[PDB]
Amino acid sequence: VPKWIQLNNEIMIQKDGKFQFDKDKEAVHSYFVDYINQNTVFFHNLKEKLDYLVENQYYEEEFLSLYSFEDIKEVFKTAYAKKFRFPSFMSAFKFYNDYALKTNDKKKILERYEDRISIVALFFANGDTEKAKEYVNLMINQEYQPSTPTFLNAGRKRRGELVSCFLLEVNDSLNDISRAIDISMQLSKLGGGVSLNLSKLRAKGEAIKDVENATKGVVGVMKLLDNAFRYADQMGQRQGSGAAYLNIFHRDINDFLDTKKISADEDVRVKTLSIGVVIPDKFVELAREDKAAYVFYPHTIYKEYGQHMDEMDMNEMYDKFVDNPRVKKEKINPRKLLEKLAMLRSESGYPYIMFQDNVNKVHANNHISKVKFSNLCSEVLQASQVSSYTDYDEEDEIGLDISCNLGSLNILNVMEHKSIEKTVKLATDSLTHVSETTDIRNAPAVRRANKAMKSIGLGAMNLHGYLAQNGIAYESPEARDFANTFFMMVNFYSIQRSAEIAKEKGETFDQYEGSTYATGEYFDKYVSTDFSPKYEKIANLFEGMHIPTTEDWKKLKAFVAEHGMYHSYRLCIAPTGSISYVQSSTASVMPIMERIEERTYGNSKTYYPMPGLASNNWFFYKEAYDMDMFKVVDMIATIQQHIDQGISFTLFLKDTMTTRDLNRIDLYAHHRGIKTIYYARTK
Amino acid sequence: VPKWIQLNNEIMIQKDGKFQFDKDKEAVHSYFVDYINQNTVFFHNLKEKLDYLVENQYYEEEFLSLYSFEDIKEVFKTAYAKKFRFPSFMSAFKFYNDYALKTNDKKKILERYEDRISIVALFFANGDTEKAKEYVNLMINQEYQPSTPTFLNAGRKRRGELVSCFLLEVNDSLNDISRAIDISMQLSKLGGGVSLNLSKLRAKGEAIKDVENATKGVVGVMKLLDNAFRYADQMGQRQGSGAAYLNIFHRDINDFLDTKKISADEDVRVKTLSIGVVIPDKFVELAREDKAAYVFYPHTIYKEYGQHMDEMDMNEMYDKFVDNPRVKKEKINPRKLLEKLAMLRSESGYPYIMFQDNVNKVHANNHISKVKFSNLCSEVLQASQVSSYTDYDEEDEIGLDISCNLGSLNILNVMEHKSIEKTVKLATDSLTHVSETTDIRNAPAVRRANKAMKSIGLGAMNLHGYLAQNGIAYESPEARDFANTFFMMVNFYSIQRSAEIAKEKGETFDQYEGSTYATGEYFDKYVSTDFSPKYEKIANLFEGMHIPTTEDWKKLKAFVAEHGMYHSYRLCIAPTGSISYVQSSTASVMPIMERIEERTYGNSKTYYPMPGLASNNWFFYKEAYDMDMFKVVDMIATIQQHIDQGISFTLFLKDTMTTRDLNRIDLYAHHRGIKTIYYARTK
Amino acid sequence: DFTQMFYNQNVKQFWLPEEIALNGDLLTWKYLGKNEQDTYMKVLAGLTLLDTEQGNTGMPIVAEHVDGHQRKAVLNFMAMMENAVHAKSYSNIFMTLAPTETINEVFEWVKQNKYLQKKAQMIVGLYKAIQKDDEISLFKAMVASVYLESFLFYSGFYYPLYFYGQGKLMQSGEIINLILRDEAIHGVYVGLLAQEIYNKQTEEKKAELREFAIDLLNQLYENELEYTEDLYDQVGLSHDVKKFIRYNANKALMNLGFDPYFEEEDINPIVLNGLKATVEPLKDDDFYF
Amino acid sequence: DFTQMFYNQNVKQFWLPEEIALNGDLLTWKYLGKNEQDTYMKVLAGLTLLDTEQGNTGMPIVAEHVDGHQRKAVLNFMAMMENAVHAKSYSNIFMTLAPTETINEVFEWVKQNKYLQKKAQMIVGLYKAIQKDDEISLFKAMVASVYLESFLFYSGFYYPLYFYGQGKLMQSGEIINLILRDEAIHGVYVGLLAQEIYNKQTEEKKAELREFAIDLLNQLYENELEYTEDLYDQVGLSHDVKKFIRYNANKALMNLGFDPYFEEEDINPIVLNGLKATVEPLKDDDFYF
């Protein structure tokens, strides 16, 4: 066993009844003085390194050609001047195993952390040396972390796409289904997770040109998509991951759910395609009143009204659907469907739950389209227009397929540096650059939506780490007050940066004029309610930083009205799974699953303590499963009120609790304004 | 139990030690006195019937509008003047259960046999009343039978395409694979059987964008195609049928074959995807000499030579591939592979066997392309060019995808009417009309090849029926003499009609000038070898009909040289599954499987004796399984020497014979010039 | 003199229920009265129970005590057929014809049915009473097994055969005929092993063994009468089934080398109407003609 | 979670000895040296003897103590394959290659052989020690069974696979490959049944069961090394056979849900070429907060 492995395992060997957390630090030293420094490839100077990486097809030469070598040297020197040290063994291990650039045979390390950060910063700046240094300082301080696609692939010749998630709308036609399968394979080839809205597809037993009971429903398309994602599995490196979203009022909703039952037959079971359910407020109202609900056949509704079932408001059209004899429907028990959802989430963690009305009551771009589904991580909530892929030799009507670039603020590092504004603006600029340089030649709706919406996702990580390292319980009202203030600041500065980009470029996102940003409605709660901290401890935490007031929000509203906004969507809180290790941060705004996690790598086992875990903050690092899910819902709703897109909200459940407890948590989330629920992980 | 079913089951009841075959005739009468006439919709006049069928979206207005009502009435009167009577119960049952037009509620019969024949004739003639009457006389004499798609769908508004055999070339790309899946779905939606060539696809463990061990091979593509064919199942009417062809020198050939093993796992086995193997002469030579063979990685060959492995002659390329270090290959035992093929055919009848050099040594259009694969029934053998389907908003390079037009001569009815020439020419004209009226807007290469090649397949059936009713054993040399003469006349008149159509329209098929028809090579064996019958009995059978001599063939060769040939391909012998029942004929040129076949429809049993079966010809109606497969191979080769495309050749084996016997039959078929082997049906 | 031919017969009879598609019975099933469907489900459930215990317990335990690798191979194969093929086939039939709740209910019904519990108690008790190297306890269990194979199954087999003979439920009926074909050879084989042990005894001991066999048969018979009435009275067939089980009791006795015990009767003629490839390598001469 | 899936895989792998014609092996057998023929005979007898224990005791004893009808059926099927298929297949190979007197002598030798006996009796000892209603003793026997199926057979399988990968003794090599494919799935299945028991134990009991498994593996492994040298030194293969034993030991451990014991090694390329939360209804007032 390696020396650093033994040093890391020495953490759990208690001394005087206490964990040896400091041993972890020793491990990193070993991991660098025995493995990383020996396995790294050193050159005489930076010029030889850059030339070797360029000619050997490791780096794209275009982004490096925008800078003179003196500027690149200055950027690299700025990166190395911080003398960044990984405080935990797992941070360095995760970076050098998942994100550091290696040779073709993967026998040596070509990229250090500073090298990777410098390359990403130079790609972000697009020829601006000062901007590149700003990005270097932002990432080496670990205030901002680009998503895994962006951080791993920026400036690389053998790179994939920098966009993490893609959302596709599938129209009710064989041509559209085949095009959706093709685009899903193309985007999984690019490495991104693909989500498909199957609510427009007509249910099982519908007519294909006057021959009835002919359609296979959404389950056949689900099987096709599952095989497509199995085939396109990132060249066999990462399993192809897809998501299917169906409205709960679709007739196939049961069969949909039956794809995830552990007793499902092979002709129905789907195993590589995640499932999500979109629940309008009408379904929750029907379940609450115990009135029997009706699921609908989408094609009959489309024939009668000319629009898809998910294209209009069910809260106002459900009674018209039910009373219409030309609309076909089936009777269901909404409470039984809710119990089935809870049982399925207990068994397998599926489906994702999207509260459609919670998303669309604060959605700023309802004029473009209502949000009808979410992404594979159930945090992207954007307007999408379905595409009409016609026959060959016929022009296709290209719609809008959602796609946003992810980037997370490290809350602990951002607040320690007292740089919410600067970090938010620089992250917005980096995400705007990632969107601008993204061009996908096989997904036309994705390309058009990227060019028009200009949507980005700016997330946050290390919420629980910051709260526990500052002596604040994650479930406490003080923690929710901190989240309210911090994310109001993040939203304020993201809107300010979006408006500044719109002013400097003279262009807004497409159809911005009909948005609530243009009409000023979006700023209502910000121009009437003060989001400054209500607790003295939180206010002290925010000292040295100008917390925006109602007057600052009014000025920002006027600025947006004058100049517009460059981005249709700005903030989305992704799960941030593996890149949180490198940043020494807790995953996303979720509470920690465990204080010390035991992970098996190779034939060895490693223990990763939570960042900053110690004796004095052991009980502030409360495990998520031990927490009240209602207070976690309260925290997520408090954050969500300042996030325009959704938050990947994983439910952390105990084995003792029943499906009724899961249903109660889901209904409280819906009541509190939670937009989406990601996972039901049971301990 | 209905009266006609009792009268049909009375056949097996033996009187005086003989089957009551004549009772079947009585059954037909009952089937018409009790059921057909009662459930047949009658109109006051044909004008009312045509108006009702057109208005209720049963027929098409376009083809009926080309004639005055007097001409349509005259065509219907010509059809009804024959007073055609089905000689067996199963003929009428199959027609009125499969082909007769029924109401939307499927309880009444709108079309009789004469009505359907008249409608198909009017569709064929395209406005010529005399031509329509000629077609009516052809089909009511049952000399020619349009295929199930053409016969069932001609003149019907609610219909699939008139072509059901489609051959697709799949290029080695994700875009091409997705396009192939889409086209397969679209053609299965039209009701056609789709065959895909997977030899150009790179094997498992190949590089994608210079990353190693990334390709899933052809088995993942087969899984995708199997899912696509399961999804597209004719609006839930018939099981989606598809075929995949792989060259035996493709490295995936074992895994390909492993998709049909019973022991194969769920992630390996494809259930609705037929498989065929293309066997070049090089593989047979390697197996014969017991030299170990090599299966090659197609992408390495493409990178080294710039052409696909299946696009070049393996006979001259195999040694260069083996000696090339940059071509990756795996060692195999060709005799072990042959034994595996025989074992798999014994277990499941798969794969289909295509002898590439047997096809291509007589292929007339090798300049366009060599025949690389066959159809789902393993009888279509045509030149195909792969298409380069690029990314979106980029122009695709459309190639040639095979789609031939099926139609079968009834050898008994044709020869008893002494009308080989007239029937062949009229069938060629009808096939040309159906090929010209076919327009598929979702298969670009299929449409392009249909427009360019103008390839049709004119088959024959009732060969064994005709031979048995004339006191000739199917395995006798007299039967092969008759087949030689009859199919040489069929080829002569098909070529004459093709040249006449080319002269009339002033156009040949695309790239005809490079064909062996243009150079006169095709006629070589016809201008030197006399194909007149060598037996007096066969000559007396051909009495009253002019048998083309060598001088006639020289005149035809000169005529083709002067005027060209309209069809790239003219003759292919399809299995003729259900139309053989309606025509009261034995299926294809195959020998009969059973003298009397027992079938179960609903909860009732039915008995179909072979047409013309009696005590006198009971011995001549020898069952296929009791026959020597070498003599069946000899007869099929005798026919194949006059057929430009292949013949659906099913092997009929006993359970006693082993895989050595199957391999011997396959090798004798290869030796005798058999182009394709369809199935290995074990009794 | 016989094991090898039984080995060959058993392995050549190998089958799986999945070979028979069952969706063809859907309509003739739908058309039966509620009484008929109830009796049919219960009949097959009673059969399932018998095969469950014959496969789990009866055949393996007899295999354990019978000497000779070939005899053990036959008995092991028969055991596999009981629980891996026969018992499972009934679930294939149930899953096709019946909704889950009706399936759940019929399996609950076997647990609480007193005649089915009594017959299982008696048969399995004898299996579990076998003592190593004690041929008499083994004989007693083999008699019990023959009575299960050749007598007890038949109150159940009657009904699928009765339908098959009328052209109803013919796919399910095909499965049942395959099961019956197997049990007939199983009963003969175990009968021959029982006779081997019986033939080793003194005349006095033989007289006691006949008493055991006849007493056991009568006890099982009396219970089967009550079971038959309980199932068949609602479909009007109890008297007919009783004649059938007596017929088969005589066949069981004959399998044991004993004289028939019940007088001959006319059985319903409907029920009477209810009754890889070898591989050679390629020679160099097979490539030339 | 797994028994029906294994049922399917087992029954679809069904095969019979008669399917492979053996006589054509004599065309390569005649060209082997005396040491090669001797090693092959001894290896074959070793496999035969061990597989007989598995058919007569190993599989039936586990089927007896495991609860669950579906598990008992799968286990019965596996026992059938040992006794009815594998045992006949080994006999067929022997009868083809050696005369009767040579077969009797090889079995006499291997029956007296110290290394074959040591492992055979160690495994059988654990099967004999299973106690009714004691899951610990059952687990220990399952570990022994997995070690036989997934590990102990492989010092033997090496040689037929070695010939098979070279184009020698192809008919018997095909048979051995089918047998080996059955033993692989047997080992995986019994492994899952052992993990089920293991997972029901306390942490201290788990550590104790791990120590048992590793200790047993060590004893068997050290004897395998001696067994290997005893058979394979005369044909110069022992080094490569030892790598194959360790590789298969690691597979056996993984079947039991344990970590690999031995470092990863490459294998001889010729041999490679041969190879439910509680459902509680919503009570209303759960929709109000």
Ligand SMILES: Nc1ncnc2c1ncn2[C@@H]1O[C@H](COP(=O)(O)OP(=O)(O)OP(=O)(O)O)[C@@H](O)[C@H]1O
């Ligand atoms: N935790 C760590 N994170 C990142 N790099 C590290 C870490 N520990 C060691 N290294 C790398 O290994 C080298 C070993 O030097 P070390 O940290 O022991 O101190 P040093 O030799 O006094 O110099 P310095 O600390 O100034 O780099 C470091 O210079 C650095 O490049």
Ligand SMILES: Nc1ncnc2c1ncn2[C@@H]1O[C@H](COP(=O)(O)OP(=O)(O)OP(=O)(O)O)[C@@H](O)[C@H]1O
């Ligand atoms: N074998 C048969 N094949 C086809 N149609 C039949 C057959 N037998 C009877 N029919 C139909 O039933 C009608 C009654 O025929 P039947 O044998 O009674 O005498 P017919 O002289 O042909 O009668 P009709 O006055 O109808 O012409 C036929 O006209 C035809 O439409």
Ligand SMILES: Cc1cn([C@H]2C[C@H](O)[C@@H](COP(=O)(O)OP(=O)(O)OP(=O)(O)O)O2)c(=O)[nH]c1=O
């Ligand atoms: C062709 C086909 C379609 N479908 C379903 C899936 C699609 O969502 C739906 C629409 O198919 P379409 O491609 O729209 O078929 P169509 O346009 O010819 O029929 P229509 O005019 O009624 O739109 O039909 C199947 O389930 N199976 C099939 O094989």
Ligand SMILES: [Mg+2]
């Ligand atoms: Mg449509």
Ligand SMILES: [Mg+2]
């Ligand atoms: Mg390519």
Ligand SMILES: [Mn+2]
């Ligand atoms: Mn049984």
Ligand SMILES: [Mn+2]
């Ligand atoms: Mn039995």
Ligand SMILES: [Mn+2]
């Ligand atoms: Mn075995």
Ligand SMILES: [Mn+2]
């Ligand atoms: Mn085994």
